[PDB]
Amino acid sequence: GKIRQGFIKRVARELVNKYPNEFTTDFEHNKKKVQELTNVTSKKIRNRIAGYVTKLVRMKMEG
Amino acid sequence: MQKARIKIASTNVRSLDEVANQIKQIAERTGVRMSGPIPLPTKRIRITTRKSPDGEGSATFDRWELRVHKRLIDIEADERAMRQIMRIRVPEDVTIEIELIS
Amino acid sequence: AIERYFIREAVREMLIDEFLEKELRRAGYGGLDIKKTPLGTKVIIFAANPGYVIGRGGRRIRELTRILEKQFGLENPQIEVEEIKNPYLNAKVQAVRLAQALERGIHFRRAAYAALRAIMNNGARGVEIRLSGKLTGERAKSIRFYQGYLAKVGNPAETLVSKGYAQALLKLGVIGVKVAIMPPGARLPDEIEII
Amino acid sequence: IQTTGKRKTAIARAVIREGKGRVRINGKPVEIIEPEIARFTILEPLILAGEEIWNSVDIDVKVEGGGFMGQAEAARMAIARALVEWTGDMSLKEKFMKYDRTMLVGDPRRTEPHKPNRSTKGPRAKRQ
Amino acid sequence: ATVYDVPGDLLVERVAQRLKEIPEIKPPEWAPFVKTGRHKERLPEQEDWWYYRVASILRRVYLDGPVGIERLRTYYGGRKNRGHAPEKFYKAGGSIIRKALQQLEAAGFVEKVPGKGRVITPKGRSFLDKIATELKKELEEIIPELKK
Amino acid sequence: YNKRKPRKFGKGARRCIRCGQYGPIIRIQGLMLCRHCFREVAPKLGFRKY
RNA sequence: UUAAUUGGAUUCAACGCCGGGAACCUCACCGGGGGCGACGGCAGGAUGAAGGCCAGGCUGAAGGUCUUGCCGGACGCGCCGAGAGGAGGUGCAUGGCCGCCGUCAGCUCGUACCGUGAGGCGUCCACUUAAGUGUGGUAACGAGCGAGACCCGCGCCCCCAGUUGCCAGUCCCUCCCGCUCGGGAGGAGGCACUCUGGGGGGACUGCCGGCGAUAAGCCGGAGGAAGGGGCGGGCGACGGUAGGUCAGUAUGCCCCGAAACCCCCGGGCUACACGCGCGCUACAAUGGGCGGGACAAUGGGACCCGACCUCGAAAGGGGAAGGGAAUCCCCUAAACCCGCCCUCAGUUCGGAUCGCGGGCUGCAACUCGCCCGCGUGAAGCUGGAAUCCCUAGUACCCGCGUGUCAUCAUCGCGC
């Protein structure tokens, strides 16, 4: 099961809402920005959140 | 030349790191050659015991562990340098054994 | 053999803990700590009522000061007694308190609910209390009162939730009391705070 | 030039220098190793490297841990890494890659711990 | 060329046939009536089995250097059948290799380092590398690749 | 006559520290604990599960 | 069957299980022997022991018992209340723990709304997931436990750290041979590489293509050491099973008080025409045997490991350095192959079985130990019905370490 957990899906939306201008399609850029804008200790969770906010940024401009 | 050998053994990793850092910070303050803390192998005590207090049911086992860590610190002979180490506050779970090798 | 030494010290330590809990049952004993110096072994005892531990004119503690040196061979046992900063945050203290309360004939629901409400009113995040055995009949039952947020599995449950087990004695038999407390100061793995 | 090879537990340290072509395993000549299948595993990479590279460099590989097949595979690993570093050519790199992917990647396979219910026979074996 | 440059079995055979000559090596009166190890079940087949042992032992000294009796016993030990019970490994007997080593000491090829075992004298090194050079020279003609 | 004979060896020699049972006692570096007794004190000794 | 083979356990979930080692001890069985029974009351006391004691008899023996008479210098016979202890019973009296339902997707709750109510919804439907996992609809809106997250080890890189490790390189020295080119061994010599272990990075459907409402998600591809919960572990919910255990501790009720208390000797717990459970060894040619070679890891080590030396054919005996552990020991392997011998036969395999001698642990192995040398050494020549496990470093095969262990494994856990 690849299903993204509910809580990372939740936490992704408010980043996009609060600082839409600070995130791009670059995975590593979003990774640093969510690393600093949050208090995540788990690197795996950091990467998950980055990989989903990247898709959110992608969907923002596709429609 | 005379060398003083310090063995620091403890279950808690962070306490071991704290004591090692304290010795290190004492070292260059005293200006004496202090060979860096070499982390020796960590000894792993393992005990496997049946969970069931009685004999009935499936046979299941529980494996309990202790990881005891150990670091080695070699420092050079300066009475001022080796005077400042009994004054170190040492946590309970950390044990330090200091010997003197020629 | 360092290995033969460390766990021997631990053996002495929780043997002392068991014996002291057997002795300090009325004192609301909380916990122990042992620190060695060349001067002697210094024992640090946290209890819900250090006044009871001191007893009367130090008569209690002095007696104990003998036994530690006698039964367990402790060199110069220097005993100190202190109060836990929040007994409602210690699972063991509340468990023993509740077991003693049930030993006084209080209806289990009333006492358990008062204790749970008091613990929550002390700032607790999650409180579970399980009472098992003869409560309202010959046949034993298990009854659970839970309140708040309380993780029950995974490492966070093991690393953060404090457990306390006690037994309450009564004419019909023994009631087993289990208490789990979730201190508010802890944070869950998935609890992310934005800025 | 130095190179390393890991296979299961066996670890092979290889050193390559300019030389006639003498290749030694634990200081022992290559052609004399008794298990012939292991001899072929050890000989596999420099076969494709070519006799010129064979006769242009000397190699000493010392292996510890594991068994004879594991040791031979570790030496095989280290030989290929040493050759590709010494020559610094991607042609033979792709040659080995095509012949065998593990040649320059290696097998990170490890033995799973045995588990209860008749643990002696393996992680997954159980009673009848 | 050294012992390292030739197979173990061929060099052992050559050393055994060469050491048949030296009178210092002689089987004891109890040698034919004792099997080489507790783990072994049937007695040794060939009457030459003594000399190969000595030829073997010296070879070990050429490689393991300071070695005691017990380490060789572990080396020459083997797997033994326990009837219906499963097999198990056991060390070899001590007296056979002890007599072989004491004869070798009398032969002067080996010496004793107390507290560490017995090592190989320069004379034994020259003997062994001479045999190995001859064997490698032959196998160079049989196998040209060893000229490399 | 009422003194037990001194047994250095055998099951009678070793008794659990806590419960005193003559049965399974773990002696790995000096525990002297009954196998039942081990489970309730292992966390106190610092044992962790992994 | 036995005086006794102490009891529990009954398919999944009892039968290498409690027993995780029964010569004593374990011990709860049986036989015999011995000592008591806290503390109070009745009576006594000391006028002298309650306890031991020579010489004996009984007593296996034990001033236990009594003949004999001493101490002992101090308060304890007997009856009542009541004990202490109980491995004595009752796991349908209990707590705790553990198995199984079940690492299964479940269990619920605040409010709303529906039904007179028991109750229903949320928790349902299409798709997807390992999953009450998630997407859209939905008289419901939200939340909790559970799943997931989390933690441990392995997998690759970097940082640091070096008396672990190094003919890495290194000026040099000694020795062996050399085909005089060279190679090996040890020292000297350095932290290279490995290992060592504290921190960080590396993998996120991350990107391409497609499928799928374009969502959730799914499939293929590439990069990559590593792919889609990376791999393997630990974490088992509400409750049920009056599932097992009061026979490890706790503890209800009953009972036992010269015993169902305590201590000692012996036997027994091993006994067997038998059936059943799980394993061990084989039922030989990929066989059996002699010689030789390269080969690991996990853990443990002071009444210990014990290198090394010596004697013995081995079992072992003596001396013995060093080691409380990266430094010394267990330590080396087996399965593997090569050279050669025997050569398809209940025989070479197969060894049960029994006799002698020797060695080892304990005070003691006849009941009832192991090991060694010799002798005998059988059944066993491929197993119906039926059913068992496993899917990748896994299964099989191979041996090793360790728990219990003075000695006992064919056992469990781990390599």
Curated annotation (Swiss-Prot), chain A:
Q: Which GO terms describe its molecular function?
A: structural constituent of ribosome
Please give the Gene3D superfamilies that the UniProt record associates with this protein: Ribosomal protein S17e-like (1.10.60.20)
A single GO cellular-component term from the record reads: cytosol
Q: Which PROSITE patterns match?
A: RIBOSOMAL_S17E
Q: Which domain of life does this protein belong to?
A: Archaea
Q: Which GO terms describe its biological process?
A: translation
Q: Give UniProt keywords alphabetically.
A: Ribonucleoprotein, Ribosomal protein
Write one Pfam family the protein is assigned to.
Ribosomal_S17e
InterPro entries noted in UniProt? Ribosomal_eS17, Ribosomal_eS17_CS, Ribosomal_eS17_sf
How does this chain assemble? Part of the 30S ribosomal subunit.
**Similarity comment:** Belongs to the eukaryotic ribosomal protein eS17 family.
PANTHER family from the entry? 40S RIBOSOMAL PROTEIN S17 (PTHR10732:SF0)
This one is known as: Small ribosomal subunit protein eS17
Per the record, the gene is rps17e
Swiss-Prot record, chain B:
Renumbered residue ranges of the record's region Disordered: 33-59
Q: Which NCBIfam families match?
A: uS10_euk_arch
Task performed by this protein: Involved in the binding of tRNA to the ribosomes.
Q: Which UniProt keywords apply?
A: Ribonucleoprotein, Ribosomal protein
Q: Which GO terms describe its cellular component?
A: small ribosomal subunit
Q: Which GO terms describe its biological process?
A: translation
- Report the family membership: Belongs to the universal ribosomal protein uS10 family.
**Which terms in the Gene Ontology molecular function aspect does this entry carry?**
structural constituent of ribosome; tRNA binding
Q: Which InterPro entries match?
A: Ribosomal_uS10, Ribosomal_uS10_CS, Ribosomal_uS10_dom, Ribosomal_uS10_dom_sf, Ribosomal_uS10_euk/arc
Q: Which Gene3D superfamilies match?
A: Ribosomal protein S10 domain (3.30.70.600)
Q: Pfam families attached here?
A: Ribosomal_S10
Q: Which SUPFAM superfamilies match?
A: Ribosomal protein S10
Name its species: Pyrococcus furiosus (strain ATCC 43587 / DSM 3638 / JCM 8422 / Vc1)
Indicate yes or no for the key word Ribosomal protein: yes
What is this protein called in UniProt? Answer: Small ribosomal subunit protein uS10
Q: How does it assemble?
A: Part of the 30S ribosomal subunit.
UniProtKB/Swiss-Prot annotation, chain D:
MF-aspect GO terms: RNA binding; structural constituent of ribosome
- Compositionally biased tracts (Basic residues): 116-128
Assigned keywords, A-Z: Ribonucleoprotein, Ribosomal protein
Recorded GO cellular component terms are: cytosolic small ribosomal subunit
Q: Which PROSITE patterns match?
A: RIBOSOMAL_S9
Q: Which family does it belong to?
A: Belongs to the universal ribosomal protein uS9 family.
Quaternary state and interactors: Part of the 30S ribosomal subunit.
Q: What is this protein called?
A: Small ribosomal subunit protein uS9
Curated annotation (Swiss-Prot), chain F:
**GO BP terms:** cytoplasmic translation
Instruction: From the UniProt annotation, give the residues forming the signal peptide.
Output: none
Question: Which residues are noted in the entry as Zn(2+)-binding?
Answer: 16, 19, 34, 37
Q: What is this protein called?
A: Small ribosomal subunit protein uS14
Q: Which UniProt keywords apply?
A: Metal-binding, Ribonucleoprotein, Ribosomal protein, RNA-binding, rRNA-binding, Zinc
Organismal lineage: Archaea, Methanobacteriati, Methanobacteriota, Thermococci, Thermococcales
> A Gene Ontology MF term for this entry?
zinc ion binding
Gene3D superfamilies noted in UniProt: 30s Ribosomal Protein S14, Chain N
**One GO term of the cellular component aspect?**
cytosolic small ribosomal subunit
Family under the similarity heading: Belongs to the universal ribosomal protein uS14 family. Zinc-binding uS14 subfamily.
On assembly, the entry states:
Part of the 30S ribosomal subunit.
Q: Could you tell me what the cofactor note in this record states?
A: Binds 1 zinc ion per subunit.
| Function per UniProt | Binds 16S rRNA, required for the assembly of 30S particles.
